[PDB]
Write a protein that binds this ligand. Structure first.
Ligand SMILES: [Cl-]
Ligand SMILES: [Cu+2]
Ligand code: NA
Length: 139
């Protein structure tokens, strides 16, 4: 069947912050921006590998996240309401209280992926806004 997954966004973390899918699973994923602040803030949800950070040539106690080198959803056909097809550079951006639901088949990309928010020049990411996606081979 279609498996329903929900990832809630809060300042500055995801619930759940860990998720496990199998290759070939039918997934319907809802990203919901449940920002609790006054005012509430926008959040990003991107699945990728290999973190890119800023560089200025000086060392940092905390590297400033700017994105993923590898997008998990590259080539992955997605359905969301009336639209079907792959989305170039797919990332989910939501104002406070907006949600977005989309469905796909988990691609043959096994192993450890990460999800993250790069907004406010990586301050959300530095504050904890990232999680881990494990892709298991089809049983
Ligand atoms: Cl960020
Ligand atoms: Cu965020
Ligand atoms: Na988002």
């Amino acid at each position: 069947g279609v498996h329903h997954y929900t990832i809630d966004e809060f300042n500055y973390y995801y619930k759940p912050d860990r998720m496990t899918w199998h290759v070939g699973e039918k997934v319907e994923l809802t990203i919901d921006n449940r920002s609790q602040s006054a005012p509430p803030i926008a959040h990003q949800f991107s699945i990728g590998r290999t973190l890119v950070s800023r560089d200025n040539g000086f060392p940092k106690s905390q590297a400033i996240a700017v994105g993923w080198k590898d997008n998990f959803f590259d080539g992955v056909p997605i359905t969301s309401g009336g639209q079907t097809g792959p989305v170039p550079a797919f990332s989910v951006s939501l104002n406070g209280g907006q949600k977005y639901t989309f469905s796909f088949v988990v691609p043959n990309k096994p192993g450890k992926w990460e999800y993250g928010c790069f907004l406010q020049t990586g301050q959300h990411f530095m504050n904890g806004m990232h999680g881990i996606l494990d892709i298991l081979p089809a049983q």
